[PDB]
Tab-separated table of C-alpha atoms and ligand atoms in Angstrom:
chain	number	residue	atom	x	y	z
A	108	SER	CA	-2.359	-0.541	33.774
A	109	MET	CA	-0.259	1.384	31.174
A	110	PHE	CA	-1.215	-0.120	28.627
A	111	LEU	CA	-4.603	-1.805	27.477
A	112	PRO	CA	-4.191	-3.621	24.118
A	113	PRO	CA	-6.847	-3.164	21.594
A	114	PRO	CA	-9.725	-5.716	20.947
A	115	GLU	CA	-8.833	-8.620	19.081
A	116	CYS	CA	-9.268	-7.963	15.118
A	117	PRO	CA	-11.168	-10.754	13.222
A	118	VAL	CA	-9.410	-13.914	12.755
A	119	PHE	CA	-10.353	-16.247	9.735
A	120	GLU	CA	-10.113	-19.846	8.922
A	121	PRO	CA	-11.171	-20.706	5.570
A	122	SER	CA	-12.142	-24.369	4.308
A	123	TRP	CA	-10.014	-25.069	1.407
A	124	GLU	CA	-12.985	-24.835	-1.002
A	125	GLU	CA	-12.841	-21.281	0.716
A	126	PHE	CA	-9.640	-20.859	0.292
A	127	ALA	CA	-9.480	-21.993	-3.125
A	128	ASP	CA	-9.810	-18.409	-4.533
A	129	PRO	CA	-7.778	-15.720	-2.262
A	130	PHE	CA	-9.862	-12.925	-4.338
A	131	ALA	CA	-13.261	-14.521	-3.563
A	132	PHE	CA	-12.233	-15.147	-0.055
A	133	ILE	CA	-10.992	-11.509	0.393
A	134	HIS	CA	-14.288	-10.221	-1.079
A	135	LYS	CA	-16.648	-12.918	1.511
A	136	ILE	CA	-15.063	-11.399	4.488
A	137	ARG	CA	-14.865	-7.695	3.056
A	138	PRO	CA	-18.076	-7.000	5.184
A	139	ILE	CA	-16.523	-7.852	8.578
A	140	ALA	CA	-12.732	-7.091	8.142
A	141	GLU	CA	-13.292	-3.376	6.719
A	142	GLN	CA	-15.068	-2.912	9.698
A	143	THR	CA	-11.581	-3.569	11.201
A	144	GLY	CA	-8.951	-2.554	8.799
A	145	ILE	CA	-7.122	-5.521	9.235
A	146	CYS	CA	-7.850	-9.261	9.714
A	147	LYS	CA	-5.815	-12.277	10.053
A	148	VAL	CA	-5.926	-15.638	8.038
A	149	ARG	CA	-5.187	-18.881	8.692
A	150	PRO	CA	-4.642	-20.774	5.805
A	151	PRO	CA	-5.894	-24.409	5.991
A	152	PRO	CA	-3.245	-26.803	8.228
A	153	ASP	CA	-1.685	-28.342	5.146
A	154	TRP	CA	-1.367	-25.555	3.155
A	155	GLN	CA	2.346	-25.008	4.124
A	156	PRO	CA	4.605	-23.966	1.014
A	157	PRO	CA	8.451	-24.906	1.744
A	158	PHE	CA	10.495	-21.914	2.889
A	159	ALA	CA	13.994	-22.888	2.048
A	160	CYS	CA	16.650	-20.202	2.211
A	161	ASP	CA	20.505	-20.192	2.213
A	162	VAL	CA	21.038	-18.017	5.481
A	163	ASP	CA	24.336	-17.599	4.912
A	164	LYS	CA	24.421	-16.577	1.010
A	165	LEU	CA	21.110	-14.019	1.725
A	166	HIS	CA	23.169	-10.762	2.541
A	167	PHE	CA	21.006	-7.645	2.871
A	168	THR	CA	21.651	-3.851	4.502
A	169	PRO	CA	19.314	-3.089	7.711
A	170	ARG	CA	17.429	-0.185	8.482
A	171	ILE	CA	18.523	1.625	11.967
A	172	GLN	CA	15.692	2.673	14.216
A	173	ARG	CA	15.227	4.524	17.349
A	174	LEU	CA	12.188	3.646	19.133
A	175	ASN	CA	10.528	7.000	20.071
A	176	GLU	CA	6.717	7.850	19.677
A	177	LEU	CA	5.389	10.662	17.567
A	178	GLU	CA	9.111	10.987	16.624
A	179	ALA	CA	9.009	11.022	12.482
A	180	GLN	CA	10.789	8.448	10.634
A	181	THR	CA	10.690	8.288	6.377
A	182	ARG	CA	9.058	5.501	5.028
A	183	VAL	CA	11.821	3.911	2.792
A	184	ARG	CA	26.338	-2.347	7.369
A	185	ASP	CA	25.686	-5.569	6.546
A	186	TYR	CA	24.068	-9.116	7.585
A	187	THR	CA	23.104	-12.493	6.381
A	188	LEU	CA	19.977	-13.645	7.428
A	189	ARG	CA	22.066	-15.729	9.678
A	190	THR	CA	24.336	-12.852	11.508
A	191	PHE	CA	21.124	-11.080	11.600
A	192	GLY	CA	18.851	-13.776	13.532
A	193	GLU	CA	22.152	-14.520	15.671
A	194	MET	CA	22.006	-10.314	16.860
A	195	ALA	CA	18.581	-10.280	16.980
A	196	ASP	CA	18.565	-13.355	19.285
A	197	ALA	CA	21.195	-11.750	21.477
A	198	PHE	CA	19.205	-8.712	21.971
A	199	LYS	CA	15.839	-10.149	22.806
A	200	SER	CA	17.948	-12.733	25.238
A	201	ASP	CA	19.526	-9.890	26.778
A	202	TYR	CA	16.743	-7.186	27.011
A	203	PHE	CA	14.999	-9.519	29.151
A	204	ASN	CA	17.391	-11.746	30.601
A	205	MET	CA	15.123	-14.750	29.295
A	206	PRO	CA	15.432	-17.396	26.968
A	207	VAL	CA	14.321	-16.230	23.862
A	208	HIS	CA	11.230	-17.637	22.967
A	209	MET	CA	10.151	-17.321	26.274
A	210	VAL	CA	9.424	-13.903	26.347
A	211	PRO	CA	5.316	-13.347	26.835
A	212	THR	CA	3.847	-11.623	23.443
A	213	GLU	CA	1.831	-9.759	25.985
A	214	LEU	CA	4.767	-8.467	27.544
A	215	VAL	CA	6.844	-7.600	24.903
A	216	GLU	CA	3.851	-5.185	23.665
A	217	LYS	CA	3.469	-3.639	26.972
A	218	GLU	CA	7.513	-3.180	27.246
A	219	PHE	CA	7.215	-2.053	23.395
A	220	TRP	CA	4.865	0.927	24.075
A	221	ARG	CA	6.735	1.663	27.550
A	222	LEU	CA	10.159	1.904	25.681
A	223	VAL	CA	8.749	4.249	23.169
A	224	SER	CA	7.522	6.693	25.842
A	225	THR	CA	9.948	7.069	28.108
A	226	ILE	CA	12.674	9.218	27.037
A	227	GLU	CA	15.265	8.391	29.176
A	228	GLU	CA	15.657	5.201	27.220
A	229	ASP	CA	17.320	5.177	24.214
A	230	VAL	CA	16.434	1.688	22.453
A	231	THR	CA	18.056	1.537	19.081
A	232	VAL	CA	16.914	-1.443	16.751
A	233	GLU	CA	17.715	-2.700	13.311
A	234	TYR	CA	14.815	-3.916	10.410
A	235	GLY	CA	15.386	-5.217	6.873
A	236	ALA	CA	12.500	-4.225	4.176
A	237	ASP	CA	13.162	-4.620	0.870
A	238	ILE	CA	12.052	-5.748	-2.577
A	239	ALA	CA	12.303	-9.279	-4.089
A	240	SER	CA	15.747	-9.276	-6.013
A	241	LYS	CA	18.231	-11.881	-7.024
A	242	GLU	CA	20.324	-10.723	-4.625
A	243	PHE	CA	17.050	-11.112	-2.189
A	244	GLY	CA	14.363	-13.355	-3.628
A	245	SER	CA	11.255	-14.373	-2.652
A	246	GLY	CA	10.214	-16.842	0.261
A	247	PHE	CA	7.237	-18.617	-1.667
A	248	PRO	CA	8.624	-20.794	-4.376
A	249	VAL	CA	9.161	-18.915	-7.861
A	250	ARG	CA	9.492	-20.695	-11.357
A	251	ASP	CA	13.073	-21.121	-12.929
A	252	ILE	CA	17.022	-23.750	-10.303
A	253	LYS	CA	14.622	-27.082	-9.928
A	254	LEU	CA	11.725	-27.200	-7.714
A	255	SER	CA	10.426	-30.505	-5.787
A	256	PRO	CA	6.505	-31.209	-6.027
A	257	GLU	CA	5.859	-29.979	-3.085
A	258	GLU	CA	7.277	-26.439	-4.246
A	259	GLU	CA	5.318	-26.881	-7.688
A	260	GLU	CA	1.944	-27.508	-6.044
A	261	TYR	CA	2.199	-24.113	-4.426
A	262	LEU	CA	3.532	-22.244	-7.434
A	263	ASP	CA	0.539	-21.451	-8.887
A	264	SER	CA	-1.097	-20.615	-5.852
A	265	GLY	CA	-3.329	-17.522	-5.452
A	266	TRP	CA	-1.881	-17.138	-1.971
A	267	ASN	CA	1.781	-17.328	-3.278
A	268	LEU	CA	2.152	-13.811	-3.003
A	269	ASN	CA	4.241	-13.513	-6.602
A	270	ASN	CA	0.767	-14.528	-8.166
A	271	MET	CA	-1.294	-12.038	-5.747
A	272	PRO	CA	-0.420	-9.472	-8.191
A	273	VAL	CA	-0.638	-10.638	-11.704
A	274	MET	CA	-3.894	-12.253	-11.163
A	275	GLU	CA	-7.423	-11.814	-13.298
A	276	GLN	CA	-9.899	-10.312	-10.281
A	277	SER	CA	-7.032	-8.088	-9.347
A	278	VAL	CA	-7.073	-4.724	-11.588
A	279	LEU	CA	-2.834	-3.728	-11.239
A	280	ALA	CA	-2.462	-6.610	-13.591
A	281	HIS	CA	-2.540	-5.089	-16.826
A	282	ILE	CA	-0.695	-1.799	-15.615
A	283	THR	CA	2.419	-1.478	-18.018
A	284	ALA	CA	3.587	2.030	-16.751
A	285	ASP	CA	4.997	-0.420	-14.243
A	286	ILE	CA	5.294	0.265	-10.725
A	287	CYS	CA	7.689	-2.135	-9.060
A	288	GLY	CA	6.574	-0.793	-5.569
A	289	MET	CA	3.254	-2.206	-5.725
A	290	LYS	CA	3.805	-5.274	-8.264
A	291	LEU	CA	6.357	-6.623	-6.599
A	292	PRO	CA	6.537	-8.377	-3.135
A	293	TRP	CA	8.667	-6.665	-0.069
A	294	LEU	CA	10.477	-9.091	2.394
A	295	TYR	CA	10.782	-8.035	5.888
A	296	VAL	CA	13.125	-9.553	8.357
A	297	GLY	CA	12.345	-8.450	11.733
A	298	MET	CA	13.760	-8.347	15.293
A	299	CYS	CA	12.303	-7.647	18.888
A	300	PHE	CA	10.636	-4.114	18.822
A	301	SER	CA	11.577	-3.276	15.048
A	302	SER	CA	8.657	-1.604	13.824
A	303	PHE	CA	6.406	-0.130	11.221
A	304	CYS	CA	5.082	3.396	11.837
A	305	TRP	CA	1.751	3.957	11.505
A	306	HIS	CA	0.793	4.323	6.981
A	307	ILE	CA	-1.782	3.389	4.785
A	308	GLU	CA	-0.853	2.662	1.176
A	309	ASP	CA	-0.480	4.022	-1.849
A	310	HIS	CA	-3.670	4.595	-3.672
A	311	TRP	CA	-5.312	3.163	-0.924
A	312	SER	CA	-4.813	-0.032	-2.128
A	313	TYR	CA	-5.322	-3.491	0.145
A	314	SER	CA	-2.105	-4.926	1.138
A	315	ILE	CA	-1.473	-8.701	2.120
A	316	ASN	CA	1.575	-9.908	4.610
A	317	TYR	CA	2.293	-13.707	5.232
A	318	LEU	CA	4.702	-14.372	7.831
A	319	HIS	CA	6.804	-17.093	6.720
A	320	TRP	CA	8.533	-18.045	10.003
A	321	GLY	CA	9.880	-16.911	13.256
A	322	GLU	CA	8.499	-15.144	16.032
A	323	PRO	CA	4.481	-13.053	16.114
A	324	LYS	CA	4.184	-10.029	14.200
A	325	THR	CA	1.913	-7.511	15.960
A	326	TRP	CA	-0.449	-5.363	14.373
A	327	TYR	CA	-2.621	-2.745	15.045
A	328	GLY	CA	-5.215	-1.563	12.537
A	329	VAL	CA	-8.035	1.012	12.379
A	330	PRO	CA	-10.808	0.676	9.287
A	331	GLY	CA	-10.472	2.836	6.402
A	332	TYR	CA	-13.926	4.834	7.596
A	333	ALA	CA	-11.603	5.658	10.734
A	334	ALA	CA	-8.502	7.173	8.587
A	335	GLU	CA	-9.136	10.987	8.061
A	336	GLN	CA	-10.395	10.500	12.315
A	337	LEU	CA	-6.947	9.095	13.077
A	338	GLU	CA	-5.064	12.040	10.711
A	339	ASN	CA	-6.998	14.594	12.997
A	340	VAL	CA	-5.529	12.743	16.241
A	341	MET	CA	-2.097	12.518	14.315
A	342	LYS	CA	-1.907	16.098	13.326
A	343	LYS	CA	-2.320	17.434	16.664
A	344	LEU	CA	0.515	15.236	18.382
A	345	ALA	CA	2.453	15.375	15.850
A	346	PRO	CA	1.874	18.287	13.426
A	347	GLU	CA	5.240	18.315	11.809
A	348	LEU	CA	4.909	14.749	10.247
A	349	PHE	CA	1.967	16.862	7.800
A	350	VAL	CA	4.605	18.952	6.727
A	351	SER	CA	4.200	18.321	2.741
A	352	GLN	CA	7.292	16.840	1.637
A	353	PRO	CA	8.818	17.070	-1.906
A	354	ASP	CA	8.345	13.108	-2.870
A	355	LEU	CA	7.223	9.760	-1.684
A	356	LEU	CA	10.752	9.350	-0.740
A	357	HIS	CA	10.178	11.933	2.105
A	358	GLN	CA	6.663	11.395	3.297
A	359	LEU	CA	6.671	10.959	7.418
A	360	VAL	CA	5.261	8.318	9.795
A	361	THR	CA	5.056	7.585	13.167
A	362	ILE	CA	5.116	5.065	16.018
A	363	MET	CA	2.134	5.914	18.508
A	364	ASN	CA	0.600	4.022	21.171
A	365	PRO	CA	-2.830	2.817	19.995
A	366	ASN	CA	-4.277	3.679	23.741
A	367	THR	CA	-3.675	7.255	22.492
A	368	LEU	CA	-6.025	6.906	19.440
A	369	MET	CA	-8.403	4.845	21.952
A	370	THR	CA	-8.983	7.850	23.837
A	371	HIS	CA	-9.737	10.116	21.012
A	372	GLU	CA	-12.292	7.419	20.047
A	373	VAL	CA	-10.734	6.020	17.085
A	374	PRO	CA	-11.169	2.253	16.681
A	375	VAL	CA	-8.307	0.382	16.778
A	376	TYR	CA	-7.883	-3.509	16.497
A	377	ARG	CA	-4.900	-5.754	17.066
A	378	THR	CA	-3.584	-8.853	16.343
A	379	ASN	CA	-0.189	-11.375	16.677
A	380	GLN	CA	0.309	-12.425	13.371
A	381	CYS	CA	2.142	-15.862	13.897
A	382	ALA	CA	4.433	-18.016	10.909
A	383	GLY	CA	2.106	-19.368	8.164
A	384	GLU	CA	-0.246	-16.982	8.853
A	385	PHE	CA	-1.706	-13.726	6.535
A	386	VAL	CA	-2.488	-10.257	7.327
A	387	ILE	CA	-5.098	-8.497	5.022
A	388	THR	CA	-5.144	-4.341	5.034
A	389	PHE	CA	-7.462	-3.023	3.596
A	390	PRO	CA	-8.047	0.303	1.544
A	391	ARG	CA	-7.057	3.412	3.707
A	392	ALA	CA	-6.587	1.186	6.557
A	393	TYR	CA	-3.922	2.256	8.756
A	394	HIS	CA	-1.843	0.215	10.307
A	395	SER	CA	1.376	-0.055	12.362
A	396	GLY	CA	3.255	-2.933	14.631
A	397	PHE	CA	6.225	-4.410	16.014
A	398	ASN	CA	7.964	-7.908	15.876
A	399	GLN	CA	7.914	-9.819	18.620
A	400	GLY	CA	11.338	-11.314	17.688
A	401	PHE	CA	13.319	-12.618	14.879
A	402	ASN	CA	10.961	-13.382	12.088
A	403	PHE	CA	10.370	-13.212	8.116
A	404	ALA	CA	7.865	-11.923	6.352
A	405	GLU	CA	6.828	-10.624	2.457
A	406	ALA	CA	4.166	-8.536	1.495
A	407	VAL	CA	2.435	-7.303	-1.553
A	408	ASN	CA	-0.150	-4.822	-2.462
A	409	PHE	CA	-3.267	-5.402	-4.560
A	410	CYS	CA	-6.227	-4.172	-5.961
A	411	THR	CA	-9.212	-5.586	-6.575
A	412	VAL	CA	-12.643	-4.556	-8.210
A	413	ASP	CA	-13.933	-3.301	-4.919
A	414	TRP	CA	-11.116	-1.431	-4.908
A	415	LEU	CA	-11.503	0.995	-8.361
A	416	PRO	CA	-13.744	3.518	-6.939
A	417	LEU	CA	-11.799	4.255	-3.799
A	418	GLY	CA	-8.589	4.006	-5.806
A	419	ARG	CA	-10.258	7.358	-7.961
A	420	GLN	CA	-11.471	8.708	-4.430
A	421	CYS	CA	-7.518	8.361	-3.381
A	422	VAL	CA	-6.322	10.114	-6.456
A	423	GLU	CA	-8.563	13.244	-5.755
A	424	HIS	CA	-7.755	13.319	-1.981
A	425	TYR	CA	-4.240	13.466	-3.606
A	426	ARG	CA	-4.645	16.395	-5.285
A	427	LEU	CA	-6.086	18.525	-2.504
A	428	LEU	CA	-2.879	17.251	-0.555
A	429	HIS	CA	-0.989	18.367	-3.197
A	430	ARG	CA	0.919	14.472	-2.847
A	431	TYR	CA	2.666	12.958	-5.541
A	432	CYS	CA	0.576	9.709	-7.484
A	433	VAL	CA	2.466	6.634	-8.032
A	434	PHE	CA	0.479	6.109	-11.301
A	435	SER	CA	-2.454	7.688	-13.222
A	436	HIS	CA	-5.473	6.219	-12.169
A	437	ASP	CA	-7.291	7.280	-15.392
A	438	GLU	CA	-4.313	6.019	-17.462
A	439	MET	CA	-4.560	2.372	-15.768
A	440	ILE	CA	-8.785	2.696	-16.258
A	441	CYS	CA	-7.949	3.406	-20.165
A	442	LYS	CA	-5.383	0.707	-20.606
A	443	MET	CA	-7.820	-1.639	-19.097
A	444	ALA	CA	-10.888	-0.207	-21.511
A	445	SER	CA	-8.333	-0.473	-24.645
A	446	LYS	CA	-7.975	-4.124	-23.372
A	447	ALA	CA	-11.740	-5.086	-23.242
A	448	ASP	CA	-11.902	-8.482	-24.881
A	449	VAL	CA	-9.588	-10.323	-22.702
A	450	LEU	CA	-11.066	-8.727	-19.516
A	451	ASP	CA	-12.744	-10.674	-16.928
A	452	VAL	CA	-16.522	-9.734	-17.607
A	453	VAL	CA	-16.784	-8.438	-13.668
A	454	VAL	CA	-13.832	-6.456	-13.859
A	455	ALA	CA	-15.297	-4.889	-17.708
A	456	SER	CA	-18.326	-4.238	-15.899
A	457	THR	CA	-16.304	-2.399	-12.891
A	458	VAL	CA	-14.381	-0.521	-15.364
A	459	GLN	CA	-17.053	1.093	-17.050
A	460	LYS	CA	-18.894	2.503	-14.309
A	461	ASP	CA	-15.433	4.032	-13.463
A	462	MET	CA	-14.892	4.839	-16.893
A	463	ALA	CA	-18.509	6.594	-17.431
A	464	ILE	CA	-17.632	8.898	-13.964
A	465	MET	CA	-14.118	9.575	-15.463
A	466	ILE	CA	-15.452	10.938	-19.036
A	467	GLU	CA	-18.788	12.941	-17.239
A	468	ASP	CA	-15.926	14.750	-15.085
A	469	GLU	CA	-13.546	15.028	-18.109
A	470	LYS	CA	-16.375	16.854	-20.253
A	471	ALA	CA	-17.427	19.231	-17.402
A	472	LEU	CA	-13.599	20.516	-16.476
A	473	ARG	CA	-12.751	20.714	-20.383
A	474	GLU	CA	-16.156	22.819	-20.759
A	475	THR	CA	-14.851	24.615	-17.873
A	476	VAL	CA	-11.569	25.765	-18.950
A	477	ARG	CA	-12.994	26.875	-22.208
A	478	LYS	CA	-15.040	29.458	-20.786
A	479	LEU	CA	-11.427	30.482	-19.275
A	480	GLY	CA	-10.738	31.380	-22.921
A	481	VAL	CA	-8.385	28.572	-23.851
A	482	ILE	CA	-9.393	27.658	-26.928
A	483	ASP	CA	-6.034	25.978	-28.767
A	484	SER	CA	-5.562	22.177	-28.476
A	485	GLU	CA	-3.638	19.005	-29.561
A	486	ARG	CA	-3.767	15.783	-28.829
A	487	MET	CA	-1.133	14.346	-26.654
A	488	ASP	CA	0.109	10.750	-25.624
A	489	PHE	CA	0.915	11.478	-21.643
A	490	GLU	CA	1.822	7.923	-21.409
A	491	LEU	CA	4.976	8.184	-23.041
A	492	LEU	CA	5.782	11.250	-20.808
A	493	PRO	CA	7.884	10.181	-17.874
A	494	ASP	CA	5.776	11.020	-14.316
A	495	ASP	CA	7.942	14.156	-13.752
A	496	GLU	CA	7.344	15.652	-17.138
A	497	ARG	CA	3.731	15.331	-16.497
A	498	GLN	CA	2.671	16.513	-13.089
A	499	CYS	CA	-0.031	19.364	-12.447
A	500	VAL	CA	2.583	22.010	-11.566
A	501	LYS	CA	0.439	23.030	-8.600
A	502	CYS	CA	-1.172	20.077	-6.997
A	503	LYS	CA	1.533	17.609	-8.461
A	504	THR	CA	-0.927	15.020	-9.804
A	505	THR	CA	0.024	12.933	-12.566
A	506	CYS	CA	-1.946	14.187	-15.844
A	507	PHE	CA	-3.499	11.805	-18.284
A	508	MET	CA	-6.495	12.800	-19.716
A	509	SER	CA	-5.304	16.240	-20.090
A	510	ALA	CA	-3.497	19.185	-19.175
A	511	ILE	CA	-2.738	22.561	-20.028
A	512	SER	CA	0.344	24.111	-21.306
A	513	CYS	CA	1.498	27.833	-22.705
A	514	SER	CA	4.617	28.613	-25.008
A	515	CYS	CA	5.368	31.416	-22.108
A	516	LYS	CA	6.249	28.585	-19.727
A	517	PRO	CA	7.946	25.969	-21.853
A	518	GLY	CA	7.691	22.323	-20.412
A	519	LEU	CA	5.303	22.979	-17.806
A	520	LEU	CA	1.509	21.272	-16.971
A	521	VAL	CA	-1.039	22.277	-14.919
A	522	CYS	CA	-4.087	19.773	-14.700
A	523	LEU	CA	-7.549	21.508	-15.499
A	524	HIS	CA	-8.498	22.571	-11.619
A	525	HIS	CA	-5.468	24.696	-11.524
A	526	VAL	CA	-5.192	26.906	-15.316
A	527	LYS	CA	-5.163	29.794	-13.298
A	528	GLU	CA	-1.646	28.669	-11.797
A	529	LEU	CA	0.321	27.785	-15.153
A	530	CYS	CA	1.613	31.265	-15.497
A	531	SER	CA	0.647	34.684	-16.264
A	532	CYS	CA	0.160	35.245	-20.165
A	533	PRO	CA	-3.608	35.432	-21.055
A	534	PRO	CA	-5.849	32.058	-21.706
A	535	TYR	CA	-5.773	32.716	-25.421
A	536	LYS	CA	-2.109	31.758	-25.078
A	537	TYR	CA	-3.019	28.407	-23.015
A	538	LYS	CA	-3.269	25.283	-25.149
A	539	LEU	CA	-5.456	22.322	-23.758
A	540	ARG	CA	-3.334	18.997	-24.025
A	541	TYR	CA	-5.500	15.955	-24.226
A	542	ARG	CA	-5.623	12.315	-24.667
A	543	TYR	CA	-8.721	11.249	-26.019
A	544	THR	CA	-11.319	13.284	-27.719
A	545	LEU	CA	-14.949	12.660	-25.781
A	546	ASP	CA	-15.653	10.967	-29.115
A	547	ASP	CA	-13.007	8.892	-28.820
A	548	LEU	CA	-13.580	7.836	-25.385
A	549	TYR	CA	-17.493	6.719	-25.627
A	550	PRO	CA	-16.261	3.665	-27.875
A	551	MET	CA	-14.098	2.918	-25.345
A	552	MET	CA	-16.478	2.627	-22.938
A	553	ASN	CA	-19.412	0.759	-25.406
A	554	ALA	CA	-16.344	-2.314	-25.648
A	555	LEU	CA	-16.336	-2.504	-22.182
A	556	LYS	CA	-20.173	-2.739	-22.078
A	557	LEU	CA	-20.289	-5.177	-25.051
A	558	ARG	CA	-17.635	-7.170	-22.938
A	559	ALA	CA	-19.646	-7.374	-20.059
A	560	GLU	CA	-23.665	-7.346	-21.666
B	1067	FUM	O1	6.912	-4.449	8.742
B	1067	FUM	C1	6.093	-5.146	7.759
B	1067	FUM	O2	6.940	-6.560	8.134
B	1067	FUM	C2	5.204	-4.951	7.456
B	1067	FUM	C3	4.712	-3.810	7.461
B	1067	FUM	C4	3.490	-3.820	6.267
B	1067	FUM	O3	2.714	-4.682	5.977
B	1067	FUM	O4	2.481	-2.577	6.123
B	1068	MN	MN1	14.212	-19.565	19.094
B	1069	MN	MN1	12.387	6.592	23.488
B	1070	MN	MN1	1.633	-1.638	4.991
B	1071	MN	MN1	-5.980	23.677	-4.799
B	1072	ZN	ZN1	-3.019	20.530	-10.800
């Protein structure tokens, strides 16, 4: 009894009516799926986008992966798709001395958790993980090169993961301070035992993952509500993963047995995602897994109106951890407000709610730094500053509403939580740099209120 598989995560089979709008559907399943963190979505049976690729003209460089539980790996030779598949299939086939398509999923799972926990075995595999480029395009059809009408039906589908980010019910859309990390689909070419470590998404966003083809992808997921609980457990067993590092290029992640989590009463769910199925991860929902064999997946992050409050909670949490932000949440809120006329009216209503909190928090923060003896002030267009030039020098948060500077430490900023941390000149030498006066802010919100009624 080495491995006791976690209970199955929820599986949805939307009707074509239900399926019509992804954000509508995702909102409907949310009460269920956020209780399990991950869920699986089976498109209607005839929904099948064409995958078409030259297996010989796609090259990529693969990440080498040693399979050791609790060992630190960082988030992020040449193969064609075909050479990789030849390698992948030969590996699984030899590992089990079985026909590569005949190994039971149960067994691959059990064997995965055995080999990551045994120190004698030093199994190393290779993964491909990379964004859509001209050198490595989407597995979905994109508008250009000429498409068949089969491909054009799927060109504008909500579930084409290229359109998913930029749709109307979506929030990361009209961000202009762009991410690419979170706007653009990622492609994963898997092989047997290649894995992805426990993580949650940047800014606690949703993600959606489509397995285009090949053998299944096994997932473990934890509901967002048990996030910290999982983190406590992981802290206890692998504390060097929690040594805060100088960038998001350094955040440490690990493979860890879901049985270990279950023993400590952290709820874990599993699923085998098969070709043509979607997995959706909910905000702050931890997840990990491994591939059963040669396969091809595409994934993208996204943010709904449901998420906006969590997005603010996350940036707050990021500041306590002194973790770097991918983008400014406030800055996004204000870009939206400044486009209140062309916003979906449910979106505008939700932004207004978040903006009202932002403004009230900002009011109190400014009152506080005033009582500290910071008197001087000057407007500053923070969004013009490269991110490295507007991070709080203590908590590393990306400044947008306001910051404090000082002639004594030129170029340096702190957010208004860390006024004491800028330098040691007296606070009459400090300057409050701010994007907006409170008087600017209230009209922006009223624009949102007018749009929503
Ligand atoms: O490795 C993958 O295919 C996916 C990981 C994820 O969606 O987090
Ligand atoms: Mn096969
Ligand atoms: Mn090992
Ligand atoms: Mn993920
Ligand atoms: Mn602090
Ligand atoms: Zn700060």
